[PDB]
Design a protein around this ligand. Structure first.
Ligand SMILES: CC(C)=CCC/C(C)=C\CSP(=O)(O)OP(=O)(O)O
Ligand SMILES: [Mg+2]
Length: 289
């Protein structure tokens, strides 16, 4: 119903409040094809401090209704919101669906630039080596031993970023080392990424998902991401947050009195790009639990 319009209104108010580059011409075209999937599925609105003074704004949804799997890529292609510009990421979603059983779908949207990402989550966990036969970046295969050595072993999902022509591999935290802070300090050190704070190293002991980004332009792992859920606003560690992101924890729209959040900590090479914070609000309240 109006549920689509509440959502669209909320995104626009979020961008305007937090200084995110946005286009309504682009938001309209997205909502024409997808607005109903935002009302009917697990749905989150994200901001990130990729720049210190201005948050960018994204909105995402996951489809887990089995009968609807693949519909998102079909309607993104058919609608024209995702074109096939020949780039190496353009074949990845078709390759994934032939190789693995798919259990959930998702697409990510940039509020200025439109459709940014497509997700596929495997039916179950697979050894990351099973992915090596895809046209993934060469940096996945060349890092097979690193992956094994840090138990980034258990692949469960893909993100295909058509904006940055990169690939996120998502790993389940199966190993007892994945619940010790020392592991995350040593992983980040082995990558020569920005070391994390002590507050975050303690929180990371409860960590749930680890993601790594590969791109076709680089022989290097580009960045990694840790993710943690938080049951409501006040559960979120205020001290690890940009005053703009503290604000977002307090004002972010939801269709529920006190929504949960997923936070993401992206780390990149020390002294470079890729080390910032992502804040997703559980807009229906039915995703973090
Ligand atoms: C829509 C759902 C269920 C989850 C989306 C948010 C989440 C916790 C993880 C995947 S989004 P992410 O990999 O963090 O995107 P990038 O930072 O790689 O651009
Ligand atoms: Mg659904």
């Amino acid at each position: 119903m109006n549920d689509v319009n509440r959502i669209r209104t909320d995104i626009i108010n979020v961008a305007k409040t937090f200084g995110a580059e946005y286009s309504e011409k682009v938001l309209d075209e997205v909502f024409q094809v997808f607005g109903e999937q935002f009302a009917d599925n697990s749905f989150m609105i994200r901001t990130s401090n990729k720049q210190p003074d201005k948050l960018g704004c994204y909105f995402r949804y996951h489809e887990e209704d089995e009968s609807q799997l693949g519909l998102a890529w079909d309607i993104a292609r058919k609608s024209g919101l995702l074109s096939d510009q020949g780039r190496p990421v353009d074949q990845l979603i078709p390759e994934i669906c032939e190789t693995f059983p798919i259990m959930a779908d998702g697409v990510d949207f940039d509020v200025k630039h439109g459709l940014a990402k497509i997700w596929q989550s495997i039916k179950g966990v697979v050894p990351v080596q099973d992915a090596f036969k895809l046209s993934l970046p060469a940096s996945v295969t060349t890092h097979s031993d690193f992956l094994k050595n840090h138990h980034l072993d258990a692949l469960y999902a893909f993100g295909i970023d058509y904006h940055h022509s990169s690939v996120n591999l998502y790993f389940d935290t199966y190993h007892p080392k994945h619940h010790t802070s020392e592991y995350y300090k040593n992983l980040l050190q082995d990558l020569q990424f920005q070391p994390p704070s002590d507050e975050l190293l303690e929180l990371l002991t409860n960590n749930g998902e680890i993601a790594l980004t590969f791109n076709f332009a680089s022989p290097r792992i580009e960045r990694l991401c840790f993710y943690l859920p938080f049951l409501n606003r006040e559960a979120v560690p205020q001290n690890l947050l940009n005053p703009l992101l503290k604000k977002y924890i307090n004002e972010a729209p939801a269709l529920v009195d006190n929504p949960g959040f997923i936070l993401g900590w992206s780390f990149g090479p020390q002294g470079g790009k890729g080390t910032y914070t992502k804040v997703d609000v559980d807009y229906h309240g039915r995703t973090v639990p």
